[PDB]
RNA sequence: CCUACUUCACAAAGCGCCUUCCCCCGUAAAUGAUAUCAUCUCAACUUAGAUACCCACACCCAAGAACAGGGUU
RNA sequence: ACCUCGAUGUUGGAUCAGGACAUCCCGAUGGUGCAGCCGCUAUUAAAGGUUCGUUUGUUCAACGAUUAAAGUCCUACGUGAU
RNA sequence: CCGAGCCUGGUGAUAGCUGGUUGUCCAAGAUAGAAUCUUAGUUCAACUUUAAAUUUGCCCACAGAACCAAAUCCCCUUGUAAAUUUAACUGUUAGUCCAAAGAGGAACAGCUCUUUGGACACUAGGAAAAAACCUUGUAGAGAGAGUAAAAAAUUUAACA
């Protein structure tokens, strides 16, 4: 639900679109077992696709570890210190290309609820409403039942 | 525009004292306007949880004007919890006892039936006469317009208004009145 | 206000056909037009099969009338050609 | 009310507002225009006879033929051998 | 017993007051109907639900082209309280295979076979 | 829908737009443009030669996981689904206006 | 179950909240809500309720000009239906035909 | 409430004593139009038509289940 | 035969009664085949009141003596964790 | 704790009766009956389900179906896509209310019993709350939009 889960406002990291766009994903960390059916589609991802992925965005540095793991993981680390560890356990090569491309596309913000679908920081341009907009002044600033 | 954060925020949510004359006015049609300005439903910053109601001062609440025989037909009924304490009192008798409570019961019926209703009733000031205290007279900002245009009587039509209206019929010469 | 829009030849719902929902929502900044919207593709498939039904039914109507007229001319010639011998 | 408001002998009354009258009226007007456009067929019943017998026959040949072409799918060697890669290793 | 209902033929014989009210022509009538289901077939008998399935009117507020022939019109006379019937008028001609995709049926009842998105 | 938009702000959309993160977009179908002292509202849209609204794609996230539970009492009817929709965030970079009236 | 049935109520309560805000800020300019919405529809200015509530809060000159456009079109409807028969149409009463 | 009487006794009780304050609305009649008389008038209209009370440690108590209260000069 | 058969405990009485008025008494009026006194009938009024005994398990009924009157009912035939 | 002790055994007696029957997700799916020491149940049918073979199924137009009202049967076209048959069985077969035609009762009942059609046991909106009335069905997200049903109206007696 939304009352048990925390929420946040829709933001970016360092005004991520204004001047230039910066890839928010620093490191990927694959740990892939050499012998093991859990990390089969990980291995076929390293043999085929992790090199072309590593060239399609050079701001990401990638660490394939190749240790005897029993469940393979990928660890995305973001520019703001966020670390999202997701498992590639028994997933095919295409599903790891969509998973790794999903981690590449997003940012190090939490995946908790976002309150508003938008974020202006200058919401009002003609001046915000206060109760004395749309009220005409009177002569000498007089209020009702005031004589002088 | 171009304020700071806290003065803009204070300006948007500050509450406005209204004045509202109730001479020759029906109490429910005053209660509609008083109810709207007490909930903050006249603000586009309205939300039920932002606490954005205002203050409404209604003066001349002895000079309520019901339409029809509602002075003699409309019954205000209370029940003190004691057995046999069911007290049905017409609007005339209750207007003679406390000359505030007809407009007060009307507004209290108009407001949303929740816990903000009595806080909104404490932002409403009902005075039976012309006299309003000076600490409330120094708070008022706007006088809201009266929702019923009071019809004038024959002492109040001017002679050009009378002569502008035509004589419609000739009486006989020998007629006595 | 949809009865007014029916009076003006517009769609009754402003999200229906027209300029708000059938132009592309976005383009590249270079000037390249976007790939088409999924609902615009599905919708133009709906309008195309609708038009195909209009043409198909119209052709069955015209071929039906002309086939009836040829049956009536053959009945008239089977009336006339047996009036002898 | 005697019991269960809306069914029974003594039911509570319900009355027809101006909403419900205008709704029923505009439904009757749409209905009367349906009565207009059903009053003028483009063909008689003689003229329509058999004008779509060919297309209906071919349509049921398509449904009949889709019914009589139901059978188990093809079984391949590459699927069964393709299972063996569950123990694919590196070296 | 609530049974199926028959409708006599004088109900479906238009008058010149009706020919002037609605823009129809008794000589040279229209070929194609636009039919639109605008009343749910629930709380209706099963034969009406069946006719609404036979006419392809399962979704509401979706137009469907039918023929103006007495058999189709017999099915439309069964469910005439559930639908809306308009003539399919065609200002420009019925579309050729060149103009096949660039059509749009307007809310007036006309099928415009050259459909730009541009103002006049 | 209809997004009220300045420059330098953000919009969270609820679909993937088959675009790379960082690609510039010209938003067509603008339909009101205002400043402090004038506006420009078109019928229903504005001219593409009049208003140019630009926006980049920042991030193509998923939503927070979203539970879809159905439950009918005394009928043993209890279904749980968990759904994350895709989302893209757009940084509106500039609203440029063109003197064509 | 409340969490899923409250999505419909989220959409509903946002829309009635917007109609309250458009109602309040249009009462500030003398109009009412149905005159404002019906006569903004009749100008082919097809702004929705969310945008008009946000203009009602953050940009009230634009909302005042939309109120003058809607009341101008309302008076062109009054003078239009008043002088029946053929008369020249209103200036803001013209419609833009698309094809 | 206990002065007597009675059950009784450093008090509580009644069988004993003391105090107890406003109307009801149904009609009955004036003047008088609609309907120039008249007519009590779902005509305008005229008659018959609540105060009081309450309010700033410890020990004993007429206060009290505890707490609270009153008194301690 | 709709709730209750995995419990909604029964008539009278005691005790406390709450309510209705379609008023038995007390209050105010209209008519009367109303002289007065007693009556009869109708309008309004529910603030207050509405007895004790013999027989009977009796609510009832009869009887005895009074009373201003000894009301009609409803409240799970009010109320048995009183 | 004796209308026939208590213990062990047969004994895991038997129960048409009561209660319970534990992961996820999708799909199809509700109301003719006949027998029965039977109406608290079972068997067959009907309906439902899965697989399979085939070709017609549904709606229907002229014509047609008896003598002593609504309508139905039949039914080429047409609109459609389902139907029959084969294989395998389970389960439902203790229904309610409304509209209408009747029977019984009081021309009573939220009454009983038939028939035709809805609805509910399935979702949502309205009728105040609301199984059965009206609107509406095919499922998700949206801080978009157009609509559907939808708000009770009434105030009275002179007369020569
Ligand atoms: Mg009831
Ligand atoms: Mg029964
Ligand atoms: Mg029982
Ligand atoms: Mg009485
Ligand atoms: Mg009892
Ligand atoms: Mg008890
Ligand atoms: Mg057993
Ligand atoms: Mg049995
Ligand atoms: Mg299903
Ligand atoms: Mg038996
Ligand atoms: Mg047949
Ligand atoms: Mg029944």
Can you tell me about this structure?
The structure is cut from a larger assembly and holds seven protein chains of seven kinds. Helices cover 20% and strands 19% of the residues of chain A. Chain A has helices spanning 40-48, 50-56, 93-105; strands at residues 7-8, 25-31, 61-64, 73-78, 83-87, 113-114, 118-119. The radius of gyration of chain A is 26 Å and the shape is elongated. Chain A contains three helices and seven strands; from the N terminus they run E-E-H-H-E-E-E-H-E-E. In chain A, 21% of the residues are buried. In chain A, the strands form two sheets. Chain A has a four-stranded mixed sheet, covered by helices on one side. Chain A has a two-stranded parallel sheet with strand order 1-6. Chain A has one domain: Glutaredoxin, CATH 3.40.30. With 148 residues, chain A is α/β, with parallel strands linked by helices. In chain A, strand 4 (73-78) and strand 5 form a beta hairpin. Chain B has 177 residues and is α/β, with parallel strands linked by helices. Chain B contains eight helices and six strands; from the N terminus they run H-E-H-E-H-E-E-H-H-H-E-H-E-H. With 85 residues, chain C is mainly alpha-helical. Chain D is flat. The chains are: A alpha/beta (148), B alpha/beta (177), C mainly alpha (85), D mainly alpha (91), E alpha+beta (120), F mainly beta (101), G mainly alpha (99). Chains in contact: A-B, A-D, A-F, A-G, B-G, C-D, C-E, C-F, C-G, D-E, E-G, F-G. At the A-F interface, helix 3, strand 6 and strand 7 of A face strand 1, strand 5 and strand 8 of F. Strand 7 (118-119) of chain A pairs antiparallel with strand 1 of chain F. Bound molecules: magnesium ion (12 copies). One magnesium ion (MG) is lined by residues 1, 3-5 of chain D. The structure holds three RNA strands. Chain B: It comes from Homo sapiens (Human). Chain B: One of its GO terms (molecular function) is structural constituent of ribosome. Chain B: This is Large ribosomal subunit protein uL13m.
